[PDB]
């Protein structure tokens, strides 16, 4: 049990506080550091496990020892002394460059920094497979954990006397969040007259009962048994976008489509949803071209009308009907057209704000208008 002296520290982030307190538990004491220092002066191997009494095993990694043992020592009797020094100096300088890249000024706050095992690959000798094996990190979850960069390391001790760094590394355990489902949303374009439009929805959304939230896939790996994330992937969705996903089609923004587009049809529940005004749809069974009524925006193809259908030069056999026949445009409320470019957003927002501040006096005095 330890207490942080906050008056002396003055200013500290919650992450810095939590990492600082964890140092007391994960840092080897003075006797263990002295024991570790002496052990490191007797080994000559690139990867070596240190056994220290009734304590945890410390894995010692030397980044250029494979080169010395495999390349320099065997050729010691056949190369000049200056040549041996020149070859090792090339590796030492390149090793220092990676150490500076990892532990130099680019590392903002070393105490609370979490470094992935893959970012340590060069410092560990250029590969992490043997390090993971000697640490005992194995199982059916290794690929998902490793791909999400879930194995992290923390600096706990730097020894300038004997030139070594002690890191605390952990193998995480996966826990499934109860009731959370991650949905992958895919869209197809539709035509309003001669214009091709596309609904703007997130690539992934997450649901928990009646709750809808956004999903960030940057730290996630999609494995067949579930989505494995090394950070928090759930973040709130705006109420207007939740209205879209709950059924309000007028709350869904739409964007124009370029000339060449690869999302003009999709197979869903054995049925084919196709923009037949923008691609050519033909019924292979009857040889008849499937025409899309201009008062309709999409085509829903099922076996009851076309058992085998050709779209975009691909022949697909569809199943029984799972989507109703297309409804007219006048029975669909469409959302606002938007442009997702960064400079298009700024240009249009500037126009909108200019209109609002040209009517500042009108908008503020709205209660004197409604009353009258």
């Amino acid at each position: 049990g330890v207490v942080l002296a906050g008056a002396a520290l003055g200013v500290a982030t919650a992450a810095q506080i939590t990492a600082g307190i964890a140092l007391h538990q994960s840092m080897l004491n003075s006797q263990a550091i002295d024991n570790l220092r002496a052990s490191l002066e007797t080994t000559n191997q690139a990867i070596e496990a240190i056994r220290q009494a009734g304590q945890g095993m410390i894995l010692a990694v030397q980044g250029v020892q494979d080169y010395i043992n495999n390349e320099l020592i065997p050729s010691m009797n056949q190369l000049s002394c200056d040549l041996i020094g020149q070859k090792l100096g090339l590796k030492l300088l390149r090793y220092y460059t990676e150490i500076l890249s990892l532990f130099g000024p680019s590392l903002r706050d070393p105490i609370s920094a979490e470094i992935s095992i893959q970012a340590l690959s060069y410092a560990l000798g250029g590969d992490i497979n043997k390090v993971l094996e000697k640490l005992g990190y194995s199982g059916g979850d290794l690929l998902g954990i490793l791909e999400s960069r879930g194995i992290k390391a923390r600096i706990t001790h730097v020894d300038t006397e004997s030139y070594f760094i002690v890191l605390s590394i952990a193998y995480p355990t996966l826990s499934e969040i109860k009731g959370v489902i991650v949905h992958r949303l895919e869209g197809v374009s539709y035509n309003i007259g001669s214009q091709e439009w596309y609904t703007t929805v997130p690539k992934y959304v997450a649901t928990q009962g009646y709750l809808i939230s956004n999903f960030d896939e940057s730290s996630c790996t999609f494995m067949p048994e579930g989505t494995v994330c090394s950070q928090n992937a759930l973040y709130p969705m705006s109420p207007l976008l939740q209205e879209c996903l709950r059924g309000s089609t007028k709350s869904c923004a739409r964007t124009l489509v370029s000339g060449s587009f690869g999302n003009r049809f999709i197979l869903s529940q054995g049925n084919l949803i196709a923009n037949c005004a923008s691609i050519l749809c033909k019924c292979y069974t009857t040889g008849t071209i499937i025409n899309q009524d201009p008062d309709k925006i999409l085509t829903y193809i099922a076996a009851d009308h076309c058992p085998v259908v050709e779209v975009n030069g691909v022949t697909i056999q569809v199943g029984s009907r799972r989507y109703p026949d297309a409804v007219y445009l006048h029975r669909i409320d469409l959302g606002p057209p938007i442009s997702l470019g960064r400079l298009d957003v700024g240009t249009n927002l500037g126009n909108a704000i200019a209109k609002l501040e040209d009517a500042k006096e009108l908008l503020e005095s709205s209660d004197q208008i409604l009353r009258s």
Binding site: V3, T43, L88, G89, P110, V158, V166, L167, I212, I266
Partner: protein
Amino acid sequence: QIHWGNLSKIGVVGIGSASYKVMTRSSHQSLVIKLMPNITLLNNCTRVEIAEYRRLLRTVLEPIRDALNAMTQNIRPVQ
């Protein structure tokens, strides 16, 4: 409560669902990066190169060590 019926009328469908898993750490291990190689069998052929290497390592090791010591001096026993 995603309304798949209205979403399909504007061309949005779901193409797959999955469970959500997060990571928790229970135990930690120690991994020491030994920065000084064993050059005993290389005789004295690398004396100049090693000295330059140690000099360059200090410009990186010392600032990290000072940051670690700044935090540790503010951690007191609960007693």
